[PDB]
Design a protein around this ligand. Structure first.
Ligand SMILES: Nc1ncnc2c1ncn2[C@@H]1O[C@H](COP(=O)(O)OP(=O)(O)O)[C@@H](O)[C@H]1O
Ligand SMILES: C[C@@H](C[P@@](=O)(OP(=O)(O)O)[C@@H](C)N)C(=O)O
Ligand SMILES: [Mg+2]
Ligand SMILES: [Mg+2]
Length: 306
C-alpha cells in the first residue's frame, strides 16, 4: 500500500512472450513475499502515467529494446521512481553487444574475435576484401544481431558459403551485426544480486547452440549447478564476471554469459541487465542453489531498487 509496486511485463520486443512469463513469476513471487504488485504491460497502459498511478517503486520484468535499454530507465529517473536494475548507461551499454565488446576489450577483458557489419554495408554488397576479414576468423562463425536476446536472429555458419543467408536473417532484427568466431567449449552463466555472485551454471543444450527453443521449449537442455569446475577455474570466472560487471557500470542485479574456448580461456559473450524469470530461467536456478526461494530472490531484487 502506497508502496504499490509496478511489475513491467510484456512490452513489444521480440522477447515479449518470455517477458509476460518472467512477469507472471515475479508477480506471484512478490505477492508471496507480501508486496502489493501489479502487472503493467507497456503495450496497453502508457508508462508515462506511472507516477500518476501511485506506484512508489518499479520492478522491470521486460526484456530487450524498450525495457532493457536506457529508455525506460531514463524516464523513471526523471519521474523520480525507484526501479530494479542497472542505470541509464549500463542498460544502454549491455543491450549493445557491439559497444559492449569494444568497451570490455578496451579494458583488456577476454572477448571473442569478431567483425562488425552495418546493414548499408550489406545492401551495397560487402567487399570481397571484407570476407578476408570474416575468413581470418575461422569456420565456423556465429552471426548475431547486435541488440537482441533469447538467441533471436542468430545463426551458425560453417564455410563462407552460408553467410549471406545468416546475415539476411540477423539484419531483419538489427542494422548492426557482429560476426564472431565459434567458441568450442562449454557454456556458462553467472548471476549477480547486489554485490553477491551466485553459484555458477553450466548449460548443455541438446543441439547446436543454446537457441530460443533450447532456452524455453525443450526439456533436454541440461543444467549443472554449480558448474562442476575445479576451484581454480571457478575463481577465474567470478573475478572475470565481476570485472566485466563493474566495467559496464551495472548494478542491482543481472546475469553474464561466458564460454570456454579451445585455448582453455573464458570468453565473455554478453551481459543481461534484466534476466528472465520463467520456469526455465537461470537466475532462479542459481538462486535456489544458494538457498533462496523464488520470492526471497525477487524481494531482494526489489530491496535493491534505486
Ligand atoms: N562465440 C560463440 N560461439 C558459439 N556459440 C556462441 C557464441 N556466442 C554465443 N553463442 C551461443 O549463442 C547463444 C546466444 O548467445 P548470446 O551472445 O548471449 O546472445 P543472446 O542475447 O541472444 O542470448 C549463447 O547462449 C550461446 O549458446
Ligand atoms: C535463458 C535466459 C534468457 P535471457 O535472460 O538471456 P539471453 O539474453 O541469453 O537469452 C533472456 C530473457 N534475454 C533466462 O531466462 O535465464
Ligand atoms: Mg543477452
Ligand atoms: Mg545469452
Amino acid at each position: 500500500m502506497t508502496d504499490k509496486i509496478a511489475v513491467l511485463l510484456g512490452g513489444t520486443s521480440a522477447e515479449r512472450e518470455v517477458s509476460l512469463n518472467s512477469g507472471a513469476a515475479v508477480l506471484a513471487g512478490l505477492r508471496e513475499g507480501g508486496i502489493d504488485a501489479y502487472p503493467v504491460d507497456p503495450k496497453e497502459v502508457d508508462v508515462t502515467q506511472l507516477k500518476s498511478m501511485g506506484f512508489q517503486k518499479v520492478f522491470i520484468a521486460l526484456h530487450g529494446r524498450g525495457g532493457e535499454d536506457g529508455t525506460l530507465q531514463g524516464m523513471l529517473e526523471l519521474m523520480g521512481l525507484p526501479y530494479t536494475g542497472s542505470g541509464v548507461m549500463a542498460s544502454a551499454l549491455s543491450m549493445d553487444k557491439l559497444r559492449s565488446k569494444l568497451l570490455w576489450q578496451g579494458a583488456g577483458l577476454p572477448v571473442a574475435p569478431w567483425v562488425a557489419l552495418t546493414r548499408a554495408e550489406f545492401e551495397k554488397g560487402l567487399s570481397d576484401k571484407q570476407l578476408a576479414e570474416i575468413s581470418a576468423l575461422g569456420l565456423p562463425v556465429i552471426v548475431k544481431p547486435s541488440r537482441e536476446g533469447s538467441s533471436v536472429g542468430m545463426s551458425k555458419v560453417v564455410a563462407e558459403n552460408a553467410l549471406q543467408d545468416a546475415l539476411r536473417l540477423a539484419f531483419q532484427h538489427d542494422e548492426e551485426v557482429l560476426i564472431e568466431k565459434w567458441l568450442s567449449g562449454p557454456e556458462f552463466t553467472v548471476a549477480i544480486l547486489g554485490e553477491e555472485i551466485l553459484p555458477s551454471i553450466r548449460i548443455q543444450p541438446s543441439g547446436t547452440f543454446y537457441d530460443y527453443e533450447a532456452k524455453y521449449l525443450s526439456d533436454e537442455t541440461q543444467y549443472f549447478c554449480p558448474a562442476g569446475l575445479e576451484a581454480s577455474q571457478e575463481a577465474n570466472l567470478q573475478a572475470l564476471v565481476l570485472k566485466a560487471w563493474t566495467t559496464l557500470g551495472c548494478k542491482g542485479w543481472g546475469r553474464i554469459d561466458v564460454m570456454l574456448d579451445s585455448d582453455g580461456q573464458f570468453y565473455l559473450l554478453e551481459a543481461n541487465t534484466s534476466p528472465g524469470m520463467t520456469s526455465h530461467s537461470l537466475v532462479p536456478m542459481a538462486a535456489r542453489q544458494a538457498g533462496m526461494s523464488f520470492s526471497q530472490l525477487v524481494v531482494r531484487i526489489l530491496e535493491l531498487a534505486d
